[PDB]
Design a protein around this ligand. Sequence first.
Ligand SMILES: CC(=O)N1c2ccc(-c3ccc(CN4CCCCC4)cc3)cc2[C@H](Nc2ccccc2)C[C@@H]1C
Length: 127
Amino acid sequence: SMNPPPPETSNPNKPKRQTNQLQYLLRVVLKTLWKHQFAWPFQQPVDAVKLNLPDYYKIIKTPMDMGTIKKRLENNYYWNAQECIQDFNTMFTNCYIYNKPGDDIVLMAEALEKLFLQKINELPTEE
Ligand SMILES: CC(=O)N1c2ccc(-c3ccc(CN4CCCCC4)cc3)cc2[C@H](Nc2ccccc2)C[C@@H]1C
């Protein structure tokens, strides 16, 4: 019926650092995923009102999208690269949870997930 507030993208109390891994996650991984033809359902939080999906935020309790991930990286929100990778993982599993095997949106998520996994397999060593 009503959308929750979007996930936090900035907290001035959180300690910050810039690493080559987080740089890679923003400059390569997110950049590549963003421009993929199937990215568009994932570029912003699910607006369950506009989409008229009253059960979405009843089923999905940890929302995540790429707009939020991107603002996180841009804000130096992430200390660990694994925080960011987990957020991409939550976004994908959210899609598979709410929707059903064989739905168009699930086929789109799957293709995005394989691209993501390929790019994280080439994640540089901390340096
Ligand atoms: C990410 C996800 O699981 N979903 C999602 C999340 C977001 C969106 C979505 C995102 C952006 C728009 C575009 N804007 C809509 C509001 C007005 C301005 C344009 C529309 C739907 C769709 C969808 C999915 N539907 C869909 C429809 C056609 C093709 C592919 C998927 C269901 C599902 C709840």
